């Protein structure tokens, strides 16, 4: 009873995601195609290495335009989110226009003509990189199709890249683990910056929240972009808001079967999923926090795997419910409000009941 363009686009994008995932899953069988298909199914088609590599360059040459479109869109939205965060950490909360202002939530609690004029002015300013001191007009909640296509392409990249697959000063003990490491960015030096900035969570034991970004939780990492020691179109940093210039950027960027060795080079440079995720970290986390009822159910989604606290706690609670429905005994405790007899009864009962060699 709605007939909204966005949901039709989202359904088309979901179909595209499924077909791209099927393509990637088929290509994952190439290295073992002489044992998974040509020896199991009685009806199989023989494949040759040269034809295989021709097929791979064919799939790259066919996916290039939508890939460029997705790169442009995600780059523009990530740049706009980064600019928003930078101005939020550099602007007065007092003024009505500041990001960290209760009036800009737009979800907890103005004219249509004003909204359209704001969007038109935002586009006109963003095109010519003239977007300082005033927030962009973007609805990152109105790009669900971009979300699905980004997820599909990231899945393809991860599948093929995984199919392909330091001491003293940089001692192993002085390096962050998966708890604090950020993919696609060089971890901050544990020495130069002090505790108050490198690990803000240590300074204040109350910064934890159900809505707590990992960034403010564990400081701001750095990324090796801009022309400094870089001469690639992708390596050029994303400090450009619009989508017209960010369209001419990636456009101008231009034997046994068991050793197929995919390459994923795509845009002329070796593509690793870590750096790509690091490029769009803000938009990736925002997508994981806004779109999760629909893109979450898709198997192997990058947002679900890199989900925030809510996904982790929900998964653990569901696991608790699953594992609690086969036991036959309760706690059956019997204690008292005292201290000494409480501890004595606790230890005696827990040792006697759950104790055996």
């Amino acid at each position: 009873n709605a007939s909204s363009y966005l949901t039709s686009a989202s359904s088309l994008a979901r179909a595209y995601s499924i077909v791209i995932r099927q393509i990637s899953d088929l290509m994952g069988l190439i290295p073992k195609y002489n044992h998974l298909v040509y020896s199991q199914i009685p009806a199989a088609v023989k494949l040759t290495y040269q034809d295989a590599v021709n097929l791979q360059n064919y799939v790259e040459e066919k996916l290039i335009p939508t890939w460029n479109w997705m790169v442009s869109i995600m780059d523009s939205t990530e740049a706009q989110l980064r600019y928003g965060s930078a101005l939020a950490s550099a602007g007065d909360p007092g003024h009505p226009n500041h990001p960290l202002h209760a009036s800009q939530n737009s979800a907890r609690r103005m004219s249509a003509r004003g909204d359209f004029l704001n969007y038109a002015l935002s586009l006109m300013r963003s095109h010519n990189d003239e977007h300082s001191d005033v927030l962009p007009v973007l609805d990152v909640c109105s790009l669900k199709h971009v979300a699905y296509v980004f997820q599909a392409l990231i899945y393809w990249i991860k599948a093929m890249n995984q199919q392909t697959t330091e001491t003293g000063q940089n001692h192993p003990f002085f390096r962050r683990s998966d708890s604090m490491t950020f993919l696609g960015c060089i971890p901050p030096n544990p020495f130069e910056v002090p505790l108050a900035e490198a690990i803000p969570l240590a300074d204040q034991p109350h910064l934890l929240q159900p809505n707590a970004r990992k960034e403010d939780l564990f400081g701001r990492p750095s990324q090796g972009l801009y022309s400094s020691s870089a001469s690639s179109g992708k390596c050029l940093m994303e400090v450009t808001v619009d989508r017209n210039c960010l369209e001419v950027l990636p456009t101008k960027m231009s034997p046994p079967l068991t050793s197929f060795r995919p390459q994923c080079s795509f845009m002329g440079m070796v593509i690793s999923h870590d750096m790509l995720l690091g490029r769009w970290r803000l938009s990736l986390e925002l997508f994981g926090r806004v779109f999760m009822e629909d893109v979450g159910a898709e198997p192997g989604s990058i947002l679900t795997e890199l989900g925030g606290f809510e996904v982790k706690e929900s998964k653990f609670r569901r696991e608790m419910e699953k594992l609690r429905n086969q036991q036959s005994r309760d706690l059956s405790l019997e204690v008292d409000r005292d201290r000494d007899l409480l501890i004595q009864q606790t230890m005696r009962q827990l040792n006697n009941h759950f104790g055996r060699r």
């Binding site: 003293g168 000063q169 001692h171 003990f173 002085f174 390096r175 962050r176 683990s177 998966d178 708890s179 604090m180 544990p190 020495f191 130069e192 002090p194 505790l195 490198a198 690990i199 969570l201 240590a202 300074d203 034991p205 109350h206 910064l207 934890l208 929240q209 159900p210 707590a212 939780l217 606290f309 809510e310 982790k312 706690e313 929900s314 998964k315 653990f316 609670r317 696991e319 608790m320 594992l323 609690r324 706690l331 827990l350 759950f354």
Partner: protein, 261 residues
């Protein structure tokens, strides 16, 4: 085991251990950055030491009072004298090899003195939960589940709190009463709010999300009664409060009630 049971029972049992304690409880790998959660003063001291190590004048600092592989252990460790590095009593600490020693210093308190307790804790935890359900978690998730909200806050109380009235004498009066109640509760500091929720749902630590509260919170605003203290039950954690037109008397009486244990 009681921590793991509270996890399994979806209840919050506030036992807020240090970051490295729960990190090694899970069987993860300890690291140096957890020293920041351990003791920020000593972490800053070690950071300044490692910063001076890069400087070429650090040995000149070592010429001040002739530092060596010897530290003054606190009374917490049990006293006595424990050699840091074998054959290191005569050998002084040198900037060319301080880094290794620095690492040792971390494990000199993170693990050297704390091997058996943490090992026993992890072993006990492994015998009540499966390995597969243990992963996907970290220190932050474990802390937000066990300790719940790091403090007791009124906004998350508002997140899960349903008010109903069996009288309906006036909606405006009901709104004014609840506004006054929330306003006075907001002015309560840490420990008093802890006790308030200890009387509300018998646990000062609110659930991390909407899920986590096995019952649904419910507070019934009864018609006013001059002498009737609010009643609470933990079977469904339901509250019954009279429509106290007088405010401060009710506030003080509930404060003294939650004061009682």
């Amino acid at each position: 085991r009681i921590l793991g049971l509270c996890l399994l029972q979806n209840e919050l049992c506030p036992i807020t251990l240090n970051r490295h304690v729960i990190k090694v409880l899970l069987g993860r790998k300890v690291n140096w950055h957890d020293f920041a959660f351990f003791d920020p003063v000593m972490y800053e001291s070690l950071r300044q030491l490692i910063l001076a190590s890069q400087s070429s004048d650090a040995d000149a600092v070592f010429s001040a009072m002739d530092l060596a592989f010897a530290i003054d252990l606190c009374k917490e460790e049990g006293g006595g004298q424990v050699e840091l590095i074998p054959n290191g009593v005569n050998i002084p600490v040198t900037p060319q090899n301080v880094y290794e020693y620095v690492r040792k210093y971390a494990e000199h308190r993170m693990l050297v003195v704390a091997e058996q307790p943490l090992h026993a804790m992890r072993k006990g935890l492994l015998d009540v939960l499966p390995k597969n359900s243990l992963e996907d978690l970290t220190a932050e998730d474990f802390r937000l589940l066990v300790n719940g909200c790091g403090e007791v806050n009124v906004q998350m109380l508002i997140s899960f709190t349903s008010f109903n009235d069996e009288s309906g004498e006036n909606a405006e009066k009901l709104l004014q009463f609840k506004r006054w109640f929330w306003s006075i509760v907001e002015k309560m500091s840490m420990t008093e709010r802890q006790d308030l929720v200890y009387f509300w749902t018998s646990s000062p630590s609110l659930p991390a999300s909407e899920e986590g509260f096995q019952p649904m919170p419910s507070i019934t605003i009864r018609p006013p009664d001059d002498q009737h203290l609010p009643t609470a039950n933990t079977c469904i954690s339901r509250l019954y409060v009279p429509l106290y037109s007088s405010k401060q008397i009710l506030k003080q009486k509930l404060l003294l009630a939650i004061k009682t244990k």
